[PDB]
Amino acid sequence: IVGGTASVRGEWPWQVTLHTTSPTQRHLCGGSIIGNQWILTAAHCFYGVESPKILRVYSGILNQSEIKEDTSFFGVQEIIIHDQYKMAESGYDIALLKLETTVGYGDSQRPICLPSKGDRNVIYTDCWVTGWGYRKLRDKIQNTLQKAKIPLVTNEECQKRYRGHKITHKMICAGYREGGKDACKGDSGGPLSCKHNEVWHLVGITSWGEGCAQRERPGVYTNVVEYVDWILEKTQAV
Numbered sequence: 001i002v003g004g005t006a007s008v009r010g011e012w013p014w015q016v017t018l019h020t021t022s023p024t025q026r027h028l029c030g031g032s033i034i035g036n037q038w039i040l041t042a043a044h045c046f047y048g049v050e051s052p053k054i055l056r057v058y059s060g061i062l063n064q065s066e067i068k069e070d071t072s073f074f075g076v077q078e079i080i081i082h083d084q085y086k087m088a089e090s091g092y093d094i095a096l097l098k099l100e101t102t103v104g105y106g107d108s109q110r111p112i113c114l115p116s117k118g119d120r121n122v123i124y125t126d127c128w129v130t131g132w133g134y135r136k137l138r139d140k141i142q143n144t145l146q147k148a149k150i151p152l153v154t155n156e157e158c159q160k161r162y163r164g165h166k167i168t169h170k171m172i173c174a175g176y177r178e179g180g181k182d183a184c185k186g187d188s189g190g191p192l193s194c195k196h197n198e199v200w201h202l203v204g205i206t207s208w209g210e211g212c213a214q215r216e217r218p219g220v221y222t223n224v225v226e227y228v229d230w231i232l233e234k235t236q237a238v
């Protein structure tokens with residue numbers, strides 16, 4: 001996260017850190033708890049991941065230093081990538097992780113509400129991007145979970161900023177015209193959380209951008225409201 005500040009413990013209890021075990025254990029991506037055996041994240045996170053056996057999901061983490069060999073984690077039973085996914089820049093950058101065990105909810109780990117279909121017309125004015133990603137283009141994964149408040153940008157304005165790309169309504173953009181606050185490397189897959197009527201909603205999934213926090217280059221997020229039926233298809237299968 002560029003231009004953000006340290007989160008307080010329990011502030012984003014749906015935020016997870018997804019680690020890869022191959023060749024050595026390291027943070028891979030962010031993710032969000034959406035159900036008691038379900039993490040919503042970005043499809044591009046699994047580039048070169050040939051098995052869910054190398055993945056570890058850690059919930060209730062503020063600091064990466066809380067993670068050692070004896071730290072409990074959730075194993076991944078299945079990786080579900082959207083069928084239409086090819087690359088982050090073309091959309092459908094969405095994936096689900098079916099956990100091997102159930103998350104026991106508490107003040108440190110609980111789900112974020114998905115947006116409502118009727119709320120496709122609501123204007124969110126209180127949106128935050130979170131993660132352990134870089135604070136600048138050439139940096140390192142941060143110990144403390146960072147947060148940054150970012151304004152949503154219309155599809156029309158985002159398309160103007162990304163000449164040569166096709167910004168679809170299945171993408172949602174967020175950023176300041178002058179730049180300075182954004183997601184960066186290692187934040188992808190994490191949430192863009194917006195508070196509406198005292199309730200947090202998972203509006204976006206950190207997907208891609210041209211560099212980090214650049215002037216007139218808003219962050220591009222998977223527009224979660226456009227995938228609610230797809231999420232229910234995969235999580236509520238009979």
Ligand SMILES: COC(=O)Nc1ccc2c(c1)NC(=O)CC/C=C/C[C@H](N1CC[C@H](c3cccc(Cl)c3)CC1=O)c1nc-2c[nH]1
Pocket residue numbers: 026027028029044045046047133140141182183184185186187188189206207208209210211212213218219220221
């Ligand atoms: C000790 O452990 C580490 O050092 N671990 C570590 C470091 C870095 C990264 C990473 C793991 N993960 C991967 O390589 C997995 C595949 C992801 C690829 C794209 C991803 N990304 C690309 C840009 C994207 C963005 C920018 C600006 C605005 C938005 Cl709205 C989104 C944010 C982002 O994380 C990214 N993550 C890393 C590099 N690039």
